[PDB]
Ligand binder design. Structure first.
Ligand SMILES: CCCCCCCCCCCCCC(=O)O
Ligand SMILES: CCCCCCCCCCCCCC(=O)O
Ligand SMILES: CCCCCCCCCCCCCC(=O)O
Ligand SMILES: CCCCCCCCCCCCCC(=O)O
Ligand SMILES: CCCCCCCCCCCCCC(=O)O
Ligand SMILES: CCCCCCCCCCCCCC(=O)O
Ligand SMILES: CCCCCCCCCCCCCC(=O)O
Ligand SMILES: CCCCCCCCCCCCCC(=O)O
Length: 582
C-alpha cells in the first residue's frame, strides 16, 4: 500500500517481524551489544504498529530502505564503533543503502560461540525462553551477516523445538546433543552452499548457471513443458543473481514473486506443491525449494528421434544452440531423477562437443549417429564408484570405513595437513553412511549434494593454506569436473616420507577418558601420521599395527597403574611396529 512497513508487519505477523528486524540490525551492526538491538527492535516495532493503525501516519510512507538507513544513522556510536560505515550516512538513497551493504564484515573478529553445558542451556531456556533464544539468534546473525535472514529464522525455530522436546527428557544431553550437531552441520553447509553458488556464478557465468538450473528444475518438475522450465530458469537465475548481491529486501521480494508465480501455476508445474502454496508468505519459497521430485509422466519416448535420428539436428541446433542444448538437457534430466545434476551436464557437454564437431564435418548424421554411446561410461563411472565404496562401507562400519579412506587419501595427497586429512576423511565417511542407506534411485543425488559440501570444505581450508598443486587444480576446475578430478588423484610416488617423531606416537592414559569422538580423532590422527611416516606400508602391515595398538589401548586402560603401562607397553608397541614396517 502507501506503507511498506505496515504491509510487512501484516504479512509476517508481529513475532516474525520482530525476529527479522533483530537479524537485520545484527547483520549490519555486528558490534553492538544485544541490549542495544533489543531496543532498536522495540522502537521499530512500535513505529510499525502506528503505520498498521494508519498508513497515513507520519513517516509511514517512507521506503523500508529509507527507514532502515535513517535508523542506522541515528546510532550514536556509529562512527566511533564502525569508522567509515558512518560515512554512508552522508549519502542519499539508493547510494546510502549500497554503501551500508558493502560495509558488512564477513569476517568479524568475534570469539567462537561456545556451546554451554546442557543443564545450563535448559535452565536458561526455562527461566527466560525469549531472551535465551533471541540472544542466540543475535550471536549467530552478527557472525554470519550475509546469511539469508528468513532461512536463519527457519533454523531458530527448529532449535526452539529441539530445547522444548529435550529439556524435559530423562536424559536431556542424549536427546539434545545429536539435534544441535545435526542443526549446526545443516546450517554451516547451507551457508557454504549459498556462498559456493554465488562464487560459481561469478567465475563460470550466467549460461553455466542456467544449464545447472535446467537440469535441476527438469528433474524436479518432469511434467512441465520446456518453455515453462525455461521460464523458471530465467526467473531463478535473476533471483540468485540479485540474492548474491546481498540486499535482503531485493532478494526476499524476488524470492516471494517466483514462489507466487509457481503457486499460481501449479497445474503447469507439479502436483506436489499444494501444501507449500498454502503456507504463509514467509515459508512459501523455502517449502518449494525443498519439494520432492514430481512423478515422471510415464510413456516418454527415447530421445533418439529428436536428438540423433532427425534430419534437422544440425539446422535446429544452429538456429539456437543453447535452447537446443537446453531442450536436450531438459528431456534427459526429466527422465533421470536418479542422476546427479553434474552427470547430466557432462552428458550435455558431450552432446554439444559432438554437434560442434559433427555438424561441421563431411557427413553430420554419420558422425553423430553413435553419440549416445559416449554417455554410457560417464553414467557408469559414478554408479560403479557408488557401488564399490558402498560395499566397502557395508563390510567395515562407518569408523573403519573412515580409516580406509584416511589410508587411501593420505597416500594420494600426503602434503595435506593431518587435521585436514582427518576432518575431510571423517566427513567423507559420513557421506558413506548417510547415502549408502538410500536405494539406488536416490544414491547419486545423495552423494552429489553431500560430497558437494565436504569437497567444498576441503577446498575452502586448502585455498586458505595451499599445499597441494593437485588439490588446487581440482578446486579451481568447473564444479562439473570437481569430483572426477578428485577421484582421478593417484598415489604421490614423488613423496619424501615424514621423519619419525617419538612424540607423534606417544600415548597417555588421558585418552582412556576422552569422548568416543575425541579418542577416534586421536587414533585417526596417528593413523594418518603412521601412513605419512611409512607411505609404502602395506595393507596387511598396517592392519598388524592397528591390531597391536588396539590390544595396547585395552590393556593399558584396563590396569591398576595407567601412566606407565602407557609409557612401558608404548615403547614396546612402537619398537615392534618400526621393524614390522621395516
Ligand atoms: C538460530 C538461533 C537459535 C540458536 C540456539 C543456539 C544454541 C547453541 C549452539 C551453539 C553452536 C553449536 O556449537 O552447536
Ligand atoms: C535454456 C537454458 C540454457 C541452457 C544452456 C545449455 C548448456 C548445456 C551444455 C553445456 C553445459 C554447461 C556446463 C558448464 O560448463 O558448467
Ligand atoms: C523509530 C523507529 C524508526 C523505524 C525504523 C524502520 C523500520 C524498517 C526496517 C527494515 C529492515 C530491512 C533491512 C534491509 O534489507 O536492508
Ligand atoms: C522489516 C522486515 C522485512 C524483512 C524482509 C524479509 C521478508 C521475508 C519474506 C520471505 C520471502 C521469501 O523468501 O520467499
Ligand atoms: C528448486 C527450485 C524451486 C524454486 C523455488 C524458489 C526459491 C529459490 C531462491 C534461491 C536464492 C535465495 C538465497 C538462498 O536462501 O540460498
Ligand atoms: C564415499 C561416498 C559414496 C560414493 C560416492 C561416489 C561418487 C558419486 C558421484 C556423484 C556426483 C558426480 O557425478 O560426480
Ligand atoms: C584431500 C583428500 C582427498 C579427497 C578425495 C575426494 C574423493 C571423492 C570421491 C571418492 C573417490 O573416488 O575416491
Ligand atoms: C611408525 C611406527 C610407530 C607406530 C605406532 C602405532 C600407531 C598406531 C595408530 C593406529 C590407529 C588405530 C586404528 C584404530 O583402531 O582406531
Amino acid at each position: 500500500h502507501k506503507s511498506e512497513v505496515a504491509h510487512r508487519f501484516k504479512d509476517l505477523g508481529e513475532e516474525n517481524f520482530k525476529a527479522l528486524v533483530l537479524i537485520a540490525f545484527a547483520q549490519y551492526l555486528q558490534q553492538c551489544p544485544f541490549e542495544d538491538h533489543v531496543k532498536l527492535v522495540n522502537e521499530v516495532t512500535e513505529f510499525a504498529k502506528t503505520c498498521v493503525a494508519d498508513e497515513s501516519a507520519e513517516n509511514c510512507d517512507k521506503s523500508l530502505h529509507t527507514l532502515f538507513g535513517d535508523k542506522l544513522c541515528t546510532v550514536a556510536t556509529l562512527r566511533e564503533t564502525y569508522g567509515e560505515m558512518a560515512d554512508c550516512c552522508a549519502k542519499q538513497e539508493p547510494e546510502r543503502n549500497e554503501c551500508f551493504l558493502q560495509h558488512k564484515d564477513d569476517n568479524p573478529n568475534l570469539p567462537r560461540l561456545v556451546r554451554p553445558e546442557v543443564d545450563v542451556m535448559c535452565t536458561a531456556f526455562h527461566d527466560n525462553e525469549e531472551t535465551f533464544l533471541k540472544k542466540y539468534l543475535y550471536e549467530i546473525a552478527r557472525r554470519h551477516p550475509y546469511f539469508y535472514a528468513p532461512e536463519l529464522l527457519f533454523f531458530a525455530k527448529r532449535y526452539k523445538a529441539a530445547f522444548t522436546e529435550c529439556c524435559q527428557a530423562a536424559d536431556k544431553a542424549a536427546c539434545l546433543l545429536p539435534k544441535l550437531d545435526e542443526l549446526r552441520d545443516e546450517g554451516k553447509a547451507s551457508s557454504a552452499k549459498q556462498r559456493l553458488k554465488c562464487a560459481s556464478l561469478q567465475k563460470f557465468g550466467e549460461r553455466a548457471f542456467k544449464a545447472w538450473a535446467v537440469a535441476r528444475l527438469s528433474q524436479r518438475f518432469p511434467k512441465a513443458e520446456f518453455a515453462e522450465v525455461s521460464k523458471l530458469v530465467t526467473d531463478l537465475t535473476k533471483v540468485h543473481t540479485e540474492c548474491c548481491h546481498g540486499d535482503l529486501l531485493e532478494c526476499a521480494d524476488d524470492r516471494a514473486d517466483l514462489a507466487k508465480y509457481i503457486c499460481e501455476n501449479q497445474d503447469s508445474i507439479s502436483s506436489k506443491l499444494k501444501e507449500c502454496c498454502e503456507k504463509p508468505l514467509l515459508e512459501k519459497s523455502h517449502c518449494i525449494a525443498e519439494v520432492e521430485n514430481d512423478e515422471m509422466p510415464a510413456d516418454l519416448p527415447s530421445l533418439a528421434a529428436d536428438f540423433v535420428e532427425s534430419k534437422d539436428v544440425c539446422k535446429n541446433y544452429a538456429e539456437a544452440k543453447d535452447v537446443f542444448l537446453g531442450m536436450f538437457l531438459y528431456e534427459y534430466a526429466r527422465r533421470h531423477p536418479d542422476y546427479s545434476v553434474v552427470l547430466l551436464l557432462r552428458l550435455a557437454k558431450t552432446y554439444e562437443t559432438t554437434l560442434e564437431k559433427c555438424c561441421a564435418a563431411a557427413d553430420p548424421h554419420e558422425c553423430y549417429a553413435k553419440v549416445f554411446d559416449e554417455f554410457k561410461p560417464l553414467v557408469e563411472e559414478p554408479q560403479n564408484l557408488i557401488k564399490q565404496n558402498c560395499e566397502l562401507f557395508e563390510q567395515l562400519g562407518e569408523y573403519k570405513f573412515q580409516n580406509a579412506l584416511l589410508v587411501r587419501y593420505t597416500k594420494k595427497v600426503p602434503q595435506v595437513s593431518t587435521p585436514t586429512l582427518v576432518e575431510v576423511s571423517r566427513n567423507l565417511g559420513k557421506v558413506g553412511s548417510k547415502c549408502c542407506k538410500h536405494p539406488e534411485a536416490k544414491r547419486m543425488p545423495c552423494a552429489e549434494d553431500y560430497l558437494s559440501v565436504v569437497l567444498n570444505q576441503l577446498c575452502v581450508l586448502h585455498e586458505k593454506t595451499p599445499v597441494s598443486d593437485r588439490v588446487t587444480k581440482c578446486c579451481t576446475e568447473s564444479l562439473v569436473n570437481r569430483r572426477p578430478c578428485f577421484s582421478a588423484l593417484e598415489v604421490d610416488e614423488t613423496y619424501v616420507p615424514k621423519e619419525f617423531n617419538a612424540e607423534t606416537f606417544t600415548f597417555h592414559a588421558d585418552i582412556c577418558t576422552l569422548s568416543e569422538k575425541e579418542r577416534q580423532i586421536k587414533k585417526q590422527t596417528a593413523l594418518v601420521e603412521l601412513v605419512k611416516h611409512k607411505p609404502k606400508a602395506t595393507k596387511e602391515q598396517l592392519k598388524a599395527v592397528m591390531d597391536d595398538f588396539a590390544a595396547f589401548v585395552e590393556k593399558c586402560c584396563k590396569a591398576d597403574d595407567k601412566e606407565t603401562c602407557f609409557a612401558e607397553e608404548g615403547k614396546k608397541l612402537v619398537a615392534a611396529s618400526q621393524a614390522a614396517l621395516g
